[PDB]
Every structure is written in structure tokens, then in C-alpha cells.
Amino acid sequence: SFELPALPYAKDALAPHISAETIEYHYGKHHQTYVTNLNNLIKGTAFEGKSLEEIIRSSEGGVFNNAAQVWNHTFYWNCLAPNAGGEPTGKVAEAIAASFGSFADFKAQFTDAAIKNFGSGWTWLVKNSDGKLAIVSTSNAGTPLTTDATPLLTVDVWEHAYYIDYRNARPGYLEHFWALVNWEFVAKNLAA
Amino acid sequence: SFELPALPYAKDALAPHISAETIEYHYGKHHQTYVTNLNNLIKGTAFEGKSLEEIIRSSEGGVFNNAAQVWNHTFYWNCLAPNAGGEPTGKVAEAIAASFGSFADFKAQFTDAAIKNFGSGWTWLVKNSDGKLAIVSTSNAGTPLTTDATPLLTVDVWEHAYYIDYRNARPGYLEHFWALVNWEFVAKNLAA
Ligand SMILES: [Fe+3]
Ligand SMILES: [Fe+3]
């Protein structure tokens, strides 16, 4: 039995960039349904009692799709915050400049990958096995946890993440995403 | 060059089941963007001298995704009509009863397949090479035209198809889809 983790801020704290209505549906209905579907699928199985990351790394099918979406959305909500956004400093800024040349080049490449990601999915900044940073996109519930790369930051590009506020304009959603990035959470993941 | 086909009815003719606002974004912006993107991707290539269907059967990646979404949305708008829906008649009802037992059983099975189709995609009623009907789901821009089966009916379950009117309630959208089905189009597709 897994519980929907509390949001680390109020429902309206990302407004106007992501509306209170979008959190009401995206957290309150979509992320909640993935926890309920996961609890129903693993009841009575060898997956009950394993951690969420263990389930994601050992399953496939509906158990995988729901477990990875529960984890992926909790990671996403922790990637956003009120009174954040802007350019990183410190260790994060040094690693981003070393791998992409500059913060501006990273932002441009991450925005391009997130807009080109066809269909539903997620676009990720990851730390590779060799210590270098990379941008990778996944489809549907796919996550870097099934690989050797460590996830540092993500953006949800499933249409429910932005359709209430931006309709078809996924570029506008990505421009507002940058005003919300919680670089303290990215710093915690870089040093993990 | 390919052109966005005219919609078969006024943009408010499917209301209250699909609003005029969903038609202006889904037809006016999403279907139009796939035509524009296809045209720009094939400019100057050998794909420029082929029918849309031949492009769908011989391409991959971006050319395929846009060409198949152009075809899939034109097919979808023709499957819907004002003053239609209800139970089919004639050869269609006969064929549905032969392969599924009855219309109520077909309707249940198609609804279920459409609700369980994970992420973005399409659910189809097809006539297989052997003559039996079957329900098939595809992901993202996937279409039965790359196989031996003949498409007869489809429902778009990309979230942009229903999010303005139904938000997360894809079952509500499918209940209202049954009120719009153009059984005349389905019969012309079966008779070939
Ligand atoms: Fe989401
Ligand atoms: Fe669509």
C-alpha cells in the first residue's frame, strides 16, 4: 500500500505559471489514480512490500506503468517551487556549464527536446555513469531509473500537464516551467 | 503538398458531445499543424511524389508521425456526424453480431480497449484479411494501414481529443462518442 505524498506547497503556489486548476486535476485526479491503480495491482503479489524504486526496476506492463508514473510525478512536483526559477549557481551551475558549454545552451537544448518529444512522455536532465550530464526523453511512463543514469530534473509533456493553461502551446508551457525550477532539489539529486 | 480537408459539418454540430472549442483546437490547430509539418518534412524528397497512404506505408520517424496523424484525423472526423449515433443497421450490424456476439458486447469491448490504451493513441474497429472484425489499439500515430487490416471506425484517445470537455474523464468522452458515430461511413468502409 502506497500513499499519495503531500504536495510540498499549496495548490495555488505555482500560479500563474501552472494554475491551481491544473494542480487540482494533475495531482488530485491523475497522480491519485496512479497510486490507487498500483495498490490494486500489487495486492497479494510478491511486489507488495517492495519499495517503489524496486518495483519500477523489476516489473513490466500495468504494474510498471502505474509505479513509474507515481514516482515520476512525485519527482516532478519536487522539481517545481514558488520563489524559485532563474539561473542555478554553485555546483549545479558548474556541472551544467561543463557538459553543455553554458546555462543558455542547456536551456535551449532541454526546451527543444521537450517540444519534439512526440506523444506522451517526459524529458529529463540526467547524470550519466561517467559523471557527465545529458538530456534524455522517455515515452509514456519510461524513466531513467531503469538505466544507470541518475535523474536530476524532469518535465511532464503529457498533454494533461499543460492543456488547461496553454492548450496546444507546449512551447509556452516550457517557457513558464523555467520560472518554477527548484534548483535546491536538482542540487540534492546531483550529489546523490 | 497536402491540404487540410474541410470538416464534414459545422464546428458546433457535434455539441454537447464534443464542443465547438474542442473542434477549433483539435481541427484548427492540431490537425493543421500535422499537415504543415508533413509538408515541410517532405519538401524536395522522393516522398513528395507519393499518395498519403504510400507515404504512411514507406516512412519512419517524423515523416511517418505527421503523415499518419494527418490521415488518422481525417478518418476520425468522418466517423462522427450530427443526428447519428445509436445502434447500426444492415450489413454493419450483421457483421458486428457475427464477430462479437452482439452490439452491446462490441460496444463494451471497444469502450474497454479505448479506456485501457495507455498514453496517446487510437482504438480501431478493423476488418481483418480473413473477413472477421476485430478491435485493435495503436500508440501515438500508429495506424492499421501499415498492416493487412482495413480500418472501419476509430476514436482518438490522445488527451487533446477530450481534455477541454471531459478533463481526465476519458470514460465520459467514450460514452458521448457513441452518440456521434456515423454508421453510414462505417458501412462504406466495410463494403470495400
Ligand atoms: Fe502527468
Ligand atoms: Fe487528435
Curated annotation (Swiss-Prot), chains A, B:
It comes from the Bacteria. Destroys superoxide anion radicals which are normally produced within the cells and which are toxic to biological systems. Its cofactor is Fe cation. One of its GO terms (molecular function) is metal ion binding. Its EC number is 1.15.1.1. Binds 1 Fe cation per subunit. The lineage of its organism: Bacteria, Pseudomonadati, Pseudomonadota, Gammaproteobacteria, Enterobacterales. It catalyses: 2 superoxide + 2 H(+) = H2O2 + O2. It is an enzyme of class 1 (oxidoreductase). This is Superoxide dismutase [Fe]. Belongs to the iron/manganese superoxide dismutase family. InterPro entries: Mn/Fe_SOD, Mn/Fe_SOD_BS, Mn/Fe_SOD_C, Mn/Fe_SOD_N, Mn/Fe_SOD_N_sf, SOD_C_sf. The modification N6-acetyllysine is found at residue 50. Homodimer. Keywords: Acetylation, Iron, Metal-binding, Oxidoreductase. Fe cation binds at residues 26, 73, 156, 160. It comes from Escherichia coli O157:H7.
